[PDB]
Amino acid sequence: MEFFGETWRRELAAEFEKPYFKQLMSFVADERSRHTVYPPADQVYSWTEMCDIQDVKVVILGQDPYHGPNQAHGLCFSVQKPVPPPPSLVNIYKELCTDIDGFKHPGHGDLSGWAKQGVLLLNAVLTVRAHQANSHKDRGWETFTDAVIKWLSVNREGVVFLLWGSYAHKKGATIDRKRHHVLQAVHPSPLSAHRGFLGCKHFSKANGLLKLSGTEPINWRAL
């Protein structure tokens, strides 16, 4: 309750009283009493604590949280120090190394530095049962995160959405292309990264779009 950013809590307030949200909360509570669920309860909404909703400049969508011990901490693609960057993040860093001048691999996979600058690192599904990918899909989270994307689409303007993978492309269909910028590419996973992600240069393009909208670019190196 206290681990949920105030501006976000206010703008997303309508969701908390909806039937799907109540059922989702009931489900997750049940799961946490019977199994180990990631990320910890107090980090499920970390993405709402790094910056205000009005200051979001870029949005990156993920699927569900990493399901390994000590990995997930509320930000998509990010892992808690000193956990090593998972395969997808390795490719994200690889693209950054060639796309952003002066970018250097930070040696860890904690993306908090980006979130603090206004990069929303949103997983479509916010919890996962330990060791079981997609174990919490189709339980209500997708609707809640759709609400987040919709709020930004309707209430903000000039936000850059980086959609990686078919799943993110579909989820991003709700985004108003007339009010925001949408960049798409295949997923950074080693299974698909070589078919378009590597070379997509979304990070420099994103900053180009921000400058255009009279907004300060993201310092992708600040990790």
Ligand SMILES: [Cl-]
């Ligand atoms: Cl738990």
